[PDB]
Design a protein around this ligand. Sequence first.
Ligand code: OHM
Lengths: 211, 222
Amino acid sequence: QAVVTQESALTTSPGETVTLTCRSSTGAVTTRNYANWVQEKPDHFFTGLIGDTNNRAPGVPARFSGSLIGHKAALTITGAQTEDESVYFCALWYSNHWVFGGGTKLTVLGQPKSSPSVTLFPPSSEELETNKATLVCTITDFYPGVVTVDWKVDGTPVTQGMETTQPSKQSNNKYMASSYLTLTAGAWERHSSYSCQVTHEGHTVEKSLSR
Amino acid sequence: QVQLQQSGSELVRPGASVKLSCKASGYTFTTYWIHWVKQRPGQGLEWIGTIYPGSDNTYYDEKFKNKATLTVDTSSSTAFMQLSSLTSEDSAVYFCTRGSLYYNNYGWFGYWGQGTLVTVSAAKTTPPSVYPLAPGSNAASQSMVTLGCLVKGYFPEPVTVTWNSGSLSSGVHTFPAVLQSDLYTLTSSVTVPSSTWPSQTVTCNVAHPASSTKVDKKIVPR
Ligand SMILES: CCCCCCCCCC(=O)CC(=O)N[C@H]1CCNC1=O
């Protein structure tokens, strides 16, 4: 029940440095949290990188370095390479358990940033005819491939009934995502404002449909 | 030459239990800890618990105190995880990984299985119900137009969608299925120019293997 916190996403470009932090809800990080760090590469291949705060694991490149700066564990990649686009989770020990951060996706820029093409869809009547309704939000052609997608019905936000696929690559190496809001045939007809909001690089693009 | 082997998938029914295995080789089993980790898609890693095959020590994390039970098998050098009263929420990929040498925290999460995808459902082979996705009276006087098909409530994975059987192939986008109350759902869109629709009919073709079914849906204006 600590909450270890990492930067959600981060971008570099090759050659540059970057530091990923990781901090504890419990206050300052101690040497005895034994901060590890673990890379996740596509297709679920994990590799340990750092143990005991700053110990580098056999095989791991000298670029990768582990630190403890004031109250927070860090991981600095110095010679950032395209091999390093990946997801990095720090993990801390609290006397009797390990707890992982939620990870930072690193994106080693390899192409100019593109903003998403959002597209909202109303329920087909045919679906409505089964007592159910589903709105569809299709996000496509964005880079880096990080977005958050929030829904709003009648001005207010929704936090149960939505699902969002994690972004995936498209042949052109940009990204795509989809979001599904579900509600019964009744609910559909009790509201009016339906809104799908997609944020990317701290710019939101929104689509809404009115019934 | 250090290696831990996890069987890829295992499907199991709500309310039941399951026993995961992790077949370690290339090192001295007895002397290194084994950890287990939960990963639901679109979520991070979640630490479950670790075992020291030498003399039965464990630390679990509170939340899985009584979901998960952890066991070794020194002879065959395989590590085991019992899952209890499996629910929808437990559908995750499950990794085991090798930790430290002996009682100490001075090591690493060195080596990782490739995981077991544990998928928890009572679903039976259901075809998809394909519904269209037309815009809209907000009338793009403009170049292009996007339309698509929801492919709802099918199981198991996968289905496969095409548009006019391949005639139209540029600027088609199919998205990942999502697990929705025991059944999968995904969608596909496709972006044509204005004049070409509804001028010329545009249909998506959706094939679902397991049900031996395959449907086409003409996308009609609203
Ligand atoms: C100052 C008291 C320390 C007591 C610690 C006992 C060891 C805990 C068991 C454990 O998690 C060992 C292990 O596998 N550690 C790995 C995990 C990643 N980095 C490690 O060192």
